[PDB]
């Protein structure tokens, strides 16, 4: 009965990559032949965050553009002033091995998650002035990977269960389970519009989900290897990918296939972190190789390198408005970058 | 402007005083690392430093010695999938690894775990405890003579027992030539790969035995001095 | 998308001899270790033998020690197991399962529960 039921299978998955094949008519990097080359991009670090004991894991970064929260393993949650680098919160966590960290849209909420299948909520605008727990959330058998904001009612979570689910903050159950993916799923990125989310397993896949409906749409097979880092294109039709075996991939939703990938022969260590830029021209993979490099989101070159790091970057974040570039590695250091006229 | 921001940098400075004052405890602490099967005695030895000396995740138990705090972590309820997490823990002190001896099935597995605990990238850096449980277990049943060990590991019989092994006041050599030849086997994985980046320290370790907090504190000692002496350019 | 499918395998009387092949694809294979995984009826997995990048380092389980040949083929993009002498204990399914991460000295996950990186496996009896 199961060889039946296999064999149906397999011919299904015939039927997608044909389909795929079909809708193939040129590489971008084909298209992109007659653009301006981006060319060398030098950029210096502005201001620098120190005074983590442990590695720093994640980070975000707030709408705003002004406060950042990071995340180490010395179990203290501190959100930063970009600008000014004072420390507006200090928060002591219940759990030191804390892998992510969320930053709300409005600013009035923190959460953050690791290793103890929790996944703590602290409130900053509080009437009494100090920050506390606010909800724990708890149901996920497995670590804590990541967690986005969708709004100050809702979070979406993702976990190495395998498994997302989406929480409400008041019910503090989970509203929606999103079921499918085989390996541990380590992030995932919210669009713009906060509609449809993608999240990368590590089973060399990643799949299209719907908040509202809580089942699968798309799903795409390029990568070799298990997806570390995953994040949406600002226009909303794209997301690069980052796997272990020294590539980086950039899948269309429309297009339902890669586009065209990114990797070079010097390269041998898997990526950690990505995002785009404001204009999405520019495409920002953290390394292991202690550093971070550059990459052109139509010409696939090499655009520059953000060296400065003794240990592998953990965490990249962009802000809203593409003003600067703050990446956070295991040394316990952060380091915010800009351009110069 | 500076009125305002008076208040800001008041509350910076008293983050930085919050943050140096847990410093000190938080470097005062050592972080431990406790795998192993679910054959493993495990909880008993966690059952045993939590008591003589004082969906949910991992767990944590806090024992101190000799007036210095030590923090060991377990697995837990997590998945069988261990490549991914398992990257965090290389700032721990060391990693207390226990290993079953006395049903010769689950041992093979035992070994291949830790060849890729000592082989992984992140974890070379630190050392691995090794703790071989259950040994009245291993000398009742090859005593008995029911359950052999060549049928699984055939270099058993040529394997001699080694000119530095001390034994026990009292005990059937078959005793000592099978675990020290259990030792042996992991010690070889152990010398394997590694040019003194990290040390394996084999112990022998019973369910009852209440030596086990003294142990690792020696244990510990020996790698912070190694490491310190390492920093010193010494070894 | 990366898959393994293995082949070989049936109804062999004890003490033949038997030779299993794999065909790797979506990967460079040649940048990637591979390990063999059985799973006898009623027991665990439990790893087999292993074969490096190159080739130049491979290693057997005691039990299985001399009696197999594991060897690979980058050209053909083909991993090979020998299998000789068998005993009847030896009746398992034999998996073919990949390292998580390339360029690397350590494979973890191989003997998972569930992996994403092995074939379905052939089912192999030694029955007289």
């Known amino acids: 009965e199961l060889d039946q039921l296999r064999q149906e299978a397999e011919q299904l998955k015939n039927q997608i990559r044909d389909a795929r094949k079909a809708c193939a008519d040129a590489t971008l990097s084909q298209i992109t032949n007659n653009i301006d080359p981006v060319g060398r991009i030098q950029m210096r670090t502005r201001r620098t965050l120190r005074g983590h004991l442990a590695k720093i894991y994640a980070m975000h970064w707030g709408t705003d553009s002004r406060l950042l929260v990071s995340a180490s393993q010395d179990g203290k949650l501190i959100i930063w002033d970009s600008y000014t680098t004072n420390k507006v919160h200090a928060i002591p966590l219940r759990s030191s091995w804390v892998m992510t960290c969320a930053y709300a849209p409005s600013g009035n909420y923190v959460a953050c998650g690791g290793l103890d299948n929790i996944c703590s909520i602290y409130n900053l605008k509080t009437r009494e002035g100090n920050v506390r727990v606010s909800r724990e959330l708890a149901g996920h058998t497995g670590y804590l990977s990541c967690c986005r904001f969708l709004d100050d009612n809702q979070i979406v979570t993702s976990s190495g269960d395998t498994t997302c689910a989406l929480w409400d903050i008041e019910t503090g159950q989970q509203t929606t389970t999103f079921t499918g993916h085989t390996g541990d799923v380590m992030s995932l990125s919210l669009a713009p519009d906060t509609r449809l989310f993608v999240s990368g397993a590590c089973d060399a896949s990643a799949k299209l989900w719907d908040v509202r409906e809580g089942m699968c749409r798309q799903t795409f097979t390029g990568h070799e290897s298990d997806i570390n880092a995953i994040c949406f294109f600002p226009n909303g039709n794209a997301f690069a990918t980052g796997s272990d075996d020294a590539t980086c991939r950039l899948f269309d939703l429309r297009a339902d296939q890669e586009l065209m990938t990114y990797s070079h022969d010097n390269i041998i260590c898997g990526i950690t972190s990505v995002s785009f830029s404001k204009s999405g021209r520019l495409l920002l993979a953290g390394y292991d190789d202690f550093n971070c490099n550059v990459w052109d989101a139509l010409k696939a070159d090499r655009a520059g390198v953000l060296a400065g790091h003794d240990n592998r970057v953990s965490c990249l974040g962009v802000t809203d408005d593409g003003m600067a570039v703050a990446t956070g590695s295991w040394d316990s250091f952060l380091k915010i970058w800009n351009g110069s006229s | 402007l500076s009125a305002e921001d008076k208040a800001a940098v008041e509350r910076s400075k008293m983050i930085e005083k919050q943050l140096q004052k847990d410093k000190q405890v938080y470097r005062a602490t050592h972080r431990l690392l406790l795998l192993g099967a679910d054959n493993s005695g495990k909880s008993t030895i966690v059952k045993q430093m939590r008591i003589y000396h004082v969906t949910s995740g991992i767990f944590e138990t806090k024992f101190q010695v000799d007036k210095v705090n030590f923090h060991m972590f377990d697995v837990g309820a997590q998945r069988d999938e261990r490549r991914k997490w398992i990257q965090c823990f290389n700032d721990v002190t060391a990693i207390i690894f226990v290993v079953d001896s006395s049903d010769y099935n689950r041992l093979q597995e035992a070994l291949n775990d830790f060849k890729s605990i000592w082989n992984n990238r992140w974890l070379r850096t630190i050392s691995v405890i090794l703790f071989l449980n259950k040994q009245d277990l291993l000398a009742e049943k090859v005593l008995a003579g029911k359950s052999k060990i060549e049928d699984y590991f055939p270099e058993f019989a040529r394997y001699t027992t080694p000119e530095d092994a001390t034994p026990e006041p009292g005990e059937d050599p078959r005793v000592t030539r099978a675990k020290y030849f259990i030792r042996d086997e992991f010690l070889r994985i152990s010398t394997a790969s590694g040019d003194g980046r990290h040390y394996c320290y084999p112990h022998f370790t019973c369910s009852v035995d209440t030596e086990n907090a003294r142990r690792i504190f020696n244990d510990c000692r020996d790698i912070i001095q190694r490491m310190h002496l390492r920093q010193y350019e010494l070894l | 998308q990366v898959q393994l499918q293995e082949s070989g395998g049936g109804l062999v009387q004890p003490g033949g001899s038997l030779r299993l092949s794999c065909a790797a694809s979506?990967?460079?294979?040649?940048?990637?270790?591979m390990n063999w995984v059985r799973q006898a009826p009623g027991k665990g997995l439990e790893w087999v033998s292993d074969?490096?990048?190159?080739?130049?380092?491979?290693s057997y389980t005691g039990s299985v020690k001399g009696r197999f040949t594991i060897s690979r083929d980058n050209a053909k993009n083909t991993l090979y197991l020998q299998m000789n002498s068998l005993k009847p204990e030896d009746t398992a399914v034999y998996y073919c399962?990949?390292?998580?991460?390339?360029?690397?000295?350590?494979?973890?996950?191989?003997?998972?529960?569930?992996?994403?990186?092995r074939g379905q496996g052939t089912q192999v009896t030694v029955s007289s």
């Open positions: 979506g990967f460079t294979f040649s940048n990637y270790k």
């Open positions: 074969i490096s990048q190159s080739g130049a380092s491979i």
């Open positions: 399962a990949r390292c998580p991460a390339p360029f690397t000295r350590d494979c973890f996950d191989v003997t998972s529960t569930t992996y994403a990186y």
